[PDB]
Amino acid sequence: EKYSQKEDKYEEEIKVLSDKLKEAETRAEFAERSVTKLEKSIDDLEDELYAQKLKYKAI
């Protein structure tokens, strides 16, 4: 019965650790998608600021 209760606490730790693992994996994938979005947005901002710089240096 001691072995039983140790195995029980073991499987408890296993379940909770796997739950937080899956949560953190989804978090990491979402963070990577966020990085992609930020690369896209900085790209667009660079383009627009550069167009305005062109016009300003022109005038």
């Binding site: 379940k15 909770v16 739950d19 937080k20 899956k22 949560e23």
Partner: protein
């Protein structure tokens, strides 16, 4: 002179002394009476058993909770439970201690009026006071700003606080809690063969719920997974042998908190009512409410409830604000801990309802100033 904290609750009495770190007495809020005949002359048959003595003689008794949904519906049994708490569990004299009782928000006035009348008359407390469980939970969490989600045995309620100010128009009270999950589990277990109909069997099912149930992060594919393999099945042993095994019931029981339609209620899940209570507050404080969700009570103790709550509120709220679910590891006693902290404050010693004030104003003094 020290004071007493007596967080009543609909499932568990937690009492103790103002200033400690944990309640001194924690026992079921239950009163049992014998059903059967009684033959052995001289056994000293008691009329009724209270507390956890009624939990060990459980097999021959019919148990009754004197609190249904945060409302005391049997005042004699509640008086029995209070008498027990004072004399046999704490072993004090109620005439030498102010008492800090606790109540849920948005429940009838007669509850507090009768509560204070009972105290002052049939216990002769020097003073008393009736707090709100959410405020005390915030005290125990060590904050002054946040939206708490207290979910005990009878009632689930949100209370948003900001800088120590309550938003009483945004308090949302819901009426499914531990007991409705216990009943839903008693019903779902029949579709696998097991039949629990007695009150004692309801206690057995409550223990099954406290041991084997958890909240699925994603209900649908969790359901499909439990259907595919059989790795989610655990076994439980009733107190006569008779091992039982449950599968998807483990997470189908607490899922009712997020889809209250499973028990035929029209309300929304706890995540949606939390979001609504937030969106009912002024636009400036809700960014700070989003990051101070304070979970409290026993029904918030399922494994994976904080993760599911955060996922749901994140899917609901704007995609910029930071959702933080604060679930302490001892969140089951936050109301009592906060009550002790409050009753221990120096600046609080003027808020008690002294016996003289009651003698002058009747039982209506309670909601009048306090």
């Amino acid at each position: 002179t020290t004071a007493l904290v007596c967080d009543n609750g609909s499932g568990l009495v937690k009492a103790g002394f103002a200033g400690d770190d944990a309640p001194r007495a924690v026992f079921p809020s239950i009163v049992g009476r014998p059903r059967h005949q009684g033959v052995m002359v001289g056994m000293g048959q008691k009329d009724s058993y209270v507390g956890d003595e009624a939990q060990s003689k459980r097999g021959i008794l019919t148990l009754k909770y004197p609190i249904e949904h945060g409302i005391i519906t049997n005042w004699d049994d509640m008086e029995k439970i209070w008498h027990h708490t004072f004399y046999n569990e704490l072993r004090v004299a109620p005439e030498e201690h102010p008492t800090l009782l606790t109540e849920a928000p948005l429940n009838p006035k007669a509850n507090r009026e009768k509560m204070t009348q009972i105290m002052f008359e049939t216990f002769n407390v020097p003073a008393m006071y009736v707090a709100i469980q959410a405020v005390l939970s915030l005290y125990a969490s060590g904050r002054t700003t946040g939206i708490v989600l207290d979910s005990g045995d009878g009632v689930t309620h949100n209370v948003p606080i900001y800088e120590g100010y309550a938003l009483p128009h945004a308090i949302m009270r819901l009426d499914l809690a531990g007991r409705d999950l216990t009943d839903y589990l008693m019903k779902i277990l029949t579709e696998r063969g097991y039949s629990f109909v007695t009150t004692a069997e309801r206690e057995i099912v409550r223990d099954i719920k406290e041991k084997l149930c958890y909240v699925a992060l994603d209900f649908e594919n969790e359901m499909a997974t439990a259907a595919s393999s059989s790795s989610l099945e655990k076994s439980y042993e009733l107190p006569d042998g008779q091992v039982i095994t449950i599968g998807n019931e483990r997470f189908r029981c607490p899922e009712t908190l997020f889809q209250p339609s499973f028990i035929g209620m029209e309300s929304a899940g706890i995540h949606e009512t939390t979001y609504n209570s937030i969106m009912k507050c002024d636009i400036d404080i809700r960014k700070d409410l989003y990051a101070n969700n304070v979970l409290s009570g026993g029904t918030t103790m399922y494994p994976g409830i904080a993760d599911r709550m955060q996922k749901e509120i994140t899917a609901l709220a704007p995609s910029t604000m930071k959702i933080k679910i604060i679930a302490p590891p001892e969140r089951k006693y936050s109301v009592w801990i906060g009550g002790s902290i409050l009753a221990s404050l120096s600046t609080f010693q003027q808020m008690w309802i002294s016996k003289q004030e009651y003698d002058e104003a009747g039982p209506s003094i309670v909601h009048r100033k306090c």
